[PDB]
Write a protein that binds this DNA or RNA. Structure first.
Ligand SMILES: Nc1ncnc2c1ncn2[C@@H]1O[C@@H]2COP(=O)(O)O[C@H]3[C@@H](O)[C@H](n4cnc5c(N)ncnc54)O[C@@H]3COP(=O)(O)O[C@H]2[C@H]1O
Ligand SMILES: Nc1ncnc2c1ncn2[C@@H]1O[C@@H]2COP(=O)(O)O[C@H]3[C@@H](O)[C@H](n4cnc5c(N)ncnc54)O[C@@H]3COP(=O)(O)O[C@H]2[C@H]1O
Lengths: 198, 201, 202, 203
DNA sequence: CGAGACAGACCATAACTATAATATCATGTATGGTCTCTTTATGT
DNA sequence: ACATAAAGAGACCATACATGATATTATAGTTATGGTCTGTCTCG
């Protein structure tokens, strides 16, 4: 709505529209500023309320003054001087980067804080107890060479409730401990084969 | 995840955990809704969705019976292969990277934009005044610096048009020949003083 | 973070169990003990107790009461609760940042549209329009007079006016002094504008 | 990025004027001439001629037609239109970029929301759950077997399975080989997970 | 010199369109409610 | 000591108070096609 006002103010102040001659029709005015008759009349009423034009005759209006349009354009340019717009857009994009940095550090803190865990049911730890007598008891996982012998990967050993994960080749499985491991049904059977718990 | 999915995945997880046996009968809709913080309608929709996958059976207006664990297990494997945290971790990192690339593109765009603009102001108090030094003056045939224009008249010369060729920001050396057009800034008083110096009244 | 009444009851009962105030063998009552204790409605209290019993924290027998079952399960449930609450708080803060950034997006869009309007309205300006630089940044040249700077000889620019506190000092002369944040209006060409920009550190 | 028919008429007529085929003092009709050439209605052609004459290029006279006035004004109008077109296409590009940013932003919002679902699902997931590592970056350790790497001695981790092409190699053993982009599943504690992360070059 | 025809401009309406507001529906929670089951007390 | 009856508590349920989101409708908007009237030019 203010676009038509500033355009007609520029045209009046330029001297193309001198004070005496009548204004163009609202149709031509609307067509020139790529706007429509409805906006046009709204802008003309605004400009009239600024005591710069009088809309008394439907065919056109007689321009009342020139310095008033100059003053209105001065106020608008003081509000909108391009350079002030350049400062505003630069500050605004610096702000843009500020919120992006804040969001980046937030998401980075979130990312580092959380530990990723899985839920694939195929790979659930089966728990088995080694109460039965075995020559394989009193021996280290590395000593028994578990995987080549049974195909099992030991995930944890429960001795007197002392749960230990990723046991390595040194941990020794005592009698009556609970061995937790992965593999398929065949691997589970082989583990019961090695320990004779089947 | 659909609102009519959270309930399905939660119920399937509880079934797979072993809380509900095959012969066991499920609780009421409002029980599930209260335990999973949803409305009874949404819980019912989720139960219907799960029954469409035939983990659950519906032979009663409100009752339901556990049917098979392995099918629910497969449903969990599908859901995990679609959402397993680590894959979401990769997505949340890649989306941040893509947004940073978009911001860099925007920064380059706006920088090129500002470089291309190079715009001037439109101040009406800054409007120039065109005078014609056609009249004889001792001040003709002299350099702006030689005349010392500002102290003498208060005017700041912005341009000396020589037969169409403007000399903007002319400096102290440019010499104003007779009949040239001097363009300058100042107030009405300054314009009068300039006409005083050049006797163009 | 806004939650539900029965959620605030459930977590409170979980902390009470963790505190050890309620014995493992005590039989509590949702209709009278819990409801009277936390001044909440009959079914609300029950909802909380059912949430606890889902996690095997409590056992709910029809017509009898809730019975304490486990301690470490309650501790684990509590810890999961703080983890989920932290995740939700971070989600809310992210959402606030997101809304602010979207609003700043529309702000930038409106600023660009207004600049397009200004650029289109240039057709009716007066010829020989002076340029305008705002000296926001600091340069040794600040706090000096035009004459001390010898501006035309440094940059090729002829200053037509300087803006300080919304006042335009048209036709400045030598004694006039450039100050930080002011708008300097000057005539010249593309080379002159670039030279002035380099000179003022901007 | 789009314009009106009368704007196109005005710019085309201005370019044709700049070509110089029309005289500096030539007269032209509209309803039976410019309208027919561009296959456009008489009033849109009038609109185009009115916007062209508004900047003091042409003069339309009631029931007389138009007369050519200025060349330099036409050139200036062409320059102004080029600048306006550049500004408009830049505006369109900015709008497209912001829309893409907003769509990606909602995507991020939903993605971080779904973490609430995964965290709430943790309460009922089976104990001793292994971790999950996606080896997307390149490490010298890639293309080697678990046994060659001697993984447990390097990181403290026990690998329970590796995912290649949506296939999980449960209970891998030594000959199994880690490949780029695969998911490595392993048991351990916080220290073990951090060690594995440092080893595979994946902050 | 007068009359008729053609062209242009202005007043106008309709169609293609987008945005903004309001209403309705769904997801939700809490409270009031009713019915069933279990436990305790009293009577035979 | 055993059986029956009554009371209390818990669970399943529905409705109302509520808020948020989505969809639809209306209004503001602009452009194009339209018609009528007036003015100017050409021809008789
Ligand atoms: N508005 C301005 N824009 C750009 N630079 C400015 C300026 N005002 C002052 N300066 C610079 O300061 C120097 C001294 O200016 P001052 O006004 O004392 O002394 C000036 C002035 O009295 C006069 N003068 C020069 N050009 C003038 C002009 N366009 N209008 C009015 N007077 C001018 O000649 C003297 C020497 O001028 P010179 O150019 O050698 O040297 C100038 C110039 O380099
Ligand atoms: N799934 C896995 N996770 C982590 N690291 C793995 C691994 N598979 C192999 N490695 C690493 O490679 C080395 C050789 O493994 P390999 O299977 O040939 O030879 C192994 C294996 O036959 C057996 N073994 C050790 N731990 C085992 C276990 N938990 N389960 C089954 N067998 C095991 O003892 C041998 C020596 O074991 P060590 O730990 O000294 O050395 C191991 C280990 O450092």
């Amino acid at each position: 709505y203010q676009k038509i006002a500033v355009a007609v103010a520029q045209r009046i102040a330029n001297g193309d529209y001198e004070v005496g001659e009548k204004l163009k029709s609202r149709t031509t005015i609307a067509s020139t500023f790529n706007v429509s008759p409805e906006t046009a009349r709204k802008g003309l009423n605004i400009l009239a309320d600024l005591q710069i034009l009088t809309l008394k005759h439907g065919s056109g209006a007689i321009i009342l003054s020139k310095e008033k349009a100059i003053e209105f354009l001065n106020q608008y340019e003081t509000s909108h001087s391009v350079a002030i717009l350049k400062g505003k857009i630069r500050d605004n994009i610096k702000a843009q980067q500020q919120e992006m940095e804040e969001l980046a550090t937030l998401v980075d803190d979130f990312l580092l804080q959380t530990r990723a865990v899985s839920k694939q049911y195929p790979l659930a730890p089966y728990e088995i107890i080694v109460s039965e007598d075995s020559e394989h008891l009193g021996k280290s996982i590395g000593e028994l060479n578990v995987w080549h012998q049974t195909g099992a990967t030991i995930v944890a050993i429960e001795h007197e409730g002392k749960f230990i994960v990723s046991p390595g080749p040194f941990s020794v499985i005592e009698q009556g401990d609970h061995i937790f491991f992965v593999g398929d049904e065949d691997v589970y059977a082989r583990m019961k084969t090695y320990f004779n718990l089947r």
